[PDB]
């Protein structure tokens, strides 16, 4: 009985492979070989934040391109002012094991989560004068790996129990759950128009999800190991993924195959964080060799290297105005490059 | 402007508080507790005293923090980086599982020990072993032979010989005999001497690290 289901699944996979092989007439490199290269790119540190005294795991940019939020395993969450290198708030944490953080677009709330299987939402602009916990979301059986703010009342999360969820904040009840993964989900990215979001998991696959409807729409493969990071193109019709096999891949949402592979023989370590730049010409990635790299989104050729850390670079972000790039690592230091 | 000066003063106060809290927290000793399924972990927790469970206890002016991660059930590699700087690992193995099979439980326990001991993250971390269930061990040694678990074994059926064999077999999976070293102790029921052994191991490790850090050798 199960044998004919297995053979039907095999036949469906073969049919879809044969169909998708019929739209690969021209490789992208065949056409993006005549325009001029970007050239060598050099960046230097312009600020350095020296408050943390433990390993740093996550960071996020505010919506005004002037404020920051960072999380580290000393049990603290610090809100920075990048212009003057000041400290605005120092929020304590109940659990010292934190692996994610987020900043609301309205600038009123800050979220964190980790190995305690709870997402905590904090209220910043209060009338008493101190940061206070607002809601504790529970109901996940794995461990949180990412969290983003859809709006001021909705938040999405990804967990290590091969499921993703969307839930309200006023009522701590799950609204929709997305199922279909096999390995642990590691990172997710939200579309600029905020109707769809994509996630990448430990089973060497990336999936697209429809927020309003509730089921998957597409599935992408091509990696030989786990996927650690994933971003979204400013257009909204592409996304890039990082993996432990020391390579980065670009995807297109109207072809359904990978298009570019960025790799080199010198690099042998994995990729931890990925992020884009405005107008889609720069692709920044973090590695385990204590260095960050910048690539051209159209040609695999390297453009520069950021080398200022003494340990593994864990988080990376780019401001909305596209004027600064911030990096945090395991050496308890945050740096801003321009 | 005056407002910027007030902001600078506030930032300096925050920095001072952070430094004080970090200095205070840079003294406690952390240890991670792991086991293999059915084992007497809770007995030890009761003796000395969702995801991570934290237990706090003190004993002559030293503060100990215990982390239990048994109720995780995920890829251990992905979340094992977070425990790099731990002082020691407490491993508990059921000695009475050498007859019961489900592929013997003893083989699973030694596989877990091999996985943890030779991990790249734990290269200088000492491991404290706990042979927990031994109150009825001698009964089933004198009722059933040791050859079922280890047919290659040949020796007398006294409890001394079996205990020595199991200890030397567990300690034989250590690859680095100079960087790290392994403690072993047989756990008794209704016994309050576990904390003393933990203290002795912790102080030995502290002196070991302190001598290695700055001065000789």
């Amino acid at each position: 009985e199960l044998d004919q289901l297995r053979q039907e699944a095999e036949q469906l996979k073969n049919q879809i492979r044969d169909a998708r092989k019929a739209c690969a007439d021209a490789t992208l490199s065949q056409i993006t070989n005549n325009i001029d290269p970007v050239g060598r790119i050099q960046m230097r540190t312009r600020r350095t934040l020296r408050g943390h005294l433990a390993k740093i795991y996550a960071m996020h940019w505010g919506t005004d391109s002037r404020l920051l939020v960072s999380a580290s395993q000393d049990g603290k969450l610090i809100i920075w002012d990048s212009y003057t290198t000041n400290k605005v708030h120092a929020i304590p944490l109940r659990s010292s094991w934190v692996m994610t953080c987020a900043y609301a677009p309205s600038g009123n709330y800050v979220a964190c989560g980790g190995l305690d299987n709870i997402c905590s939402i904090y209220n910043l602009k209060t009338r008493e004068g101190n940061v206070r916990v607002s809601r504790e979301l529970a109901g996940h059986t794995g461990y949180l790996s990412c969290c983003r703010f859809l709006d001021d009342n909705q938040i999405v999360t990804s967990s290590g129990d091969t499921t993703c969820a969307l839930w309200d904040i006023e009522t701590g009840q799950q609204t929709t759950t997305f199922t279909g993964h096999t390995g642990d989900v590691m990172s997710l990215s939200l579309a600029p128009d905020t109707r769809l979001f994509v996630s990448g998991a430990c089973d060497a696959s990336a999936k697209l999800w429809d927020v309003r409807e509730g089921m998957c729409r597409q599935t992408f493969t091509g990696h030989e190991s786990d996927i650690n990071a994933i971003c979204f193109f400013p257009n909204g019709n592409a996304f890039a993924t990082g993996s432990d096999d020391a390579t980065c891949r670009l995807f297109d949402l109207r072809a359904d195959q990978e298009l570019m592979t960025y790799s080199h023989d010198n690099i042998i370590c994995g990729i931890t964080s990925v992020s884009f730049s405005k107008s889609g010409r720069l692709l920044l990635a973090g590695y385990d060799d204590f260095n960050c790299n910048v690539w051209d989104a159209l040609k695999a050729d390297r453009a520069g290297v950021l080398a200022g850390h003494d340990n593994r670079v864990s988080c990376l972000g780019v401001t909305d105005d596209g004027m600064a790039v911030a990096t945090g690592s395991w050496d308890s230091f945050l740096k801003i490059w321009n | 402007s005056a407002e910027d000066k007030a902001a600078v003063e506030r930032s300096k106060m925050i920095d001072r508080n952070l430094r004080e809290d970090g200095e205070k927290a840079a003294r406690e000793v952390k240890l991670l507790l792991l086991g293999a399924g059915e084992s007497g972990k809770n007995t030890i927790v009761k003796q000395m005293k969702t995801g991570i469970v934290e237990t706090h206890f003190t004993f002559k002016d030293l503060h100990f923090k215990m982390f239990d991660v048994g109720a995780q059930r995920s890829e251990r590699k992905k979340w094992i980086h977070c425990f790099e700087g731990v002082t020691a690992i407490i491993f508990c193995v059921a000695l009475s599982d050498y007859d019961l099979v489900l592929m013997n439980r003893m083989h699973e326990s030694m596989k877990l020990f091999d996985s943890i001991c030779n991990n790249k993250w734990f290269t200088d971390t000492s491991i404290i072993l706990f042979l927990n269930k031994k109150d009825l061990f001698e009964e089933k040694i004198k009722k059933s032979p040791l050859t079922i678990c280890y047919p290659e074994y040949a020796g007398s059926n006294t409890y001394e010989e079996a205990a020595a064999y199991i200890q030397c077999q567990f300690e034989d999976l250590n690859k680095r005999k100079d960087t790290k070293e392994i403690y072993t102790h047989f756990t008794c029921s209704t016994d309050t001497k576990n904390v003393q052994f933990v203290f002795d191991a912790v102080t030995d490790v502290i002196i070991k690290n302190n001598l290695k850090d700055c001065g000789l050798f």
Partner: single-chain antibody
Amino acid sequence: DVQLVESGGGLVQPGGSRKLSCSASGFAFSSFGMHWVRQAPEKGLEWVAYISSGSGTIYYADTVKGRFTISRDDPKNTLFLQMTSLRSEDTAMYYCVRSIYYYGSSPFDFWGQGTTLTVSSDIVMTQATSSVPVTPGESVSISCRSSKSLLHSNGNTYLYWFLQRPGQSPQLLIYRMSNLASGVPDRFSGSGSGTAFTLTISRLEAEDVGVYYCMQHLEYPLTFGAGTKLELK
């Protein structure tokens, strides 16, 4: 929720001493800086003293520099002020004001109620107009002028607006020019520019009667304005 109540007053002869106490109730006192503001029986507002959070920097006025003492205690949430020598110009009404300072905060948010006392160079703010007739349904604007420009190189200006209803304590409307406060309707809008500032309200109501005030927060000797009335026939 937030409540500051002051006590200590009566009749003091010249050459005597007196002290005033301010009590607080639950607004994270240890992380707030406090001021003192004095109102003469006729009219006008003036600044007296200031103590920063953490008991660090302390500033006094150029008129009462040598005779006033300001102090605080984070436990018990109580503020103090000491009077050594009293002249005949010290008879006025005293208020307590809280203020905080970070990147996007709003200073001078909550005021007290008052405590009576009877004894028996610097920035100049003009606010030349004194009284203007008004009728509900039409916009009315008020203007004020300052000596020098209040536009620091940071890119932000420092001008504050206050309203004092009859028989009530002052309240904040605009903390920095073109920036609304909390608890106020959206019809208010400062929209000043350069060195001469203005304040426009779109529609009126029975609760908009009172005396308006202007303030500056650039040089720490703080100077208030004169005050304009809205008689509202």
